[PDB]
Every structure is written in C-alpha cells, then in structure tokens.
C-alpha cells in the first residue's frame, strides 16, 4: 500500500496477537474492531484476515483452529477455544 501522507486512524492490526493463555474471544474482539478500522479494502484485508487470524493465534489455539479447518466458521472457533464445544459427546474424557 501507499499514497498515504496521513491515515493513522488505527492501522495496527499487526499488534493484535493472541497470548498463549489468552481467550480467543478477547483476541477476536480487538482483532475485528481494529481490522474494521484498518486502512484497506474489504477483499484486501479479508485475504490477510484468514492468514493473520490463525497466524497470530497461539500454538494451542492454532492446533484447535486447524482441527476444525476452513470447513468450520468463526463461531465454531470461538466455542472451540472454550473447550470441546459440547461435553457428553464421545465419552472418552467426559
């Protein structure tokens, strides 16, 4: 990008990274808010989104995100980071 002498609304989505023990819900809260104000066009930023979202997620969360895959949606990810999503299913642990 370029041609911007001044456009510092809040172009800093790069600083929005999920801590190793940080809830994905709080991560997305800041991520989405900042990305919404990111100085880029929708298709441009959304292309980065799919990468950054997983990239700046911690290994543990990232492992969960990958186990779901692109076949699952953000809503699923939000619940996935919260545990398994639904206990009493496959009585292996609980």
């Amino acid at each position: 990008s370029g041609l911007v002498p001044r456009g510092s609304h809040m172009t800093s989505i790069l600083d929005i990274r999920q801590g190793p023990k940080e809830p994905f819900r709080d991560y997305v809260d800041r991520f989405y808010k900042t990305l919404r104000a990111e100085q880029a066009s929708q298709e441009v930023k959304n292309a980065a989104t799919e990468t950054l979202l997983v990239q700046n997620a911690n290994p543990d969360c990232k492992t969960i995100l990958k186990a779901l895959g692109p076949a699952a949606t953000l809503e699923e990810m939000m619940t996935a980071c919260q545990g398994v999503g639904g206990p009493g299913h496959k009585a292996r642990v609980l």
Binding site: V28, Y32, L35, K45, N46, T49, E50, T73, L74, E75
Partner: peptide
Amino acid sequence: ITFLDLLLYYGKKK
C-alpha cells in the same frame, strides 16, 4: 474465515 465472517459473527449468528 475472513473479515466477512467476522462481521457476520457480530451481526448475525450463522
């Protein structure tokens, strides 16, 4: 799983 999906998540629930 893009900004699109992020928007639909806050706006709707599917």
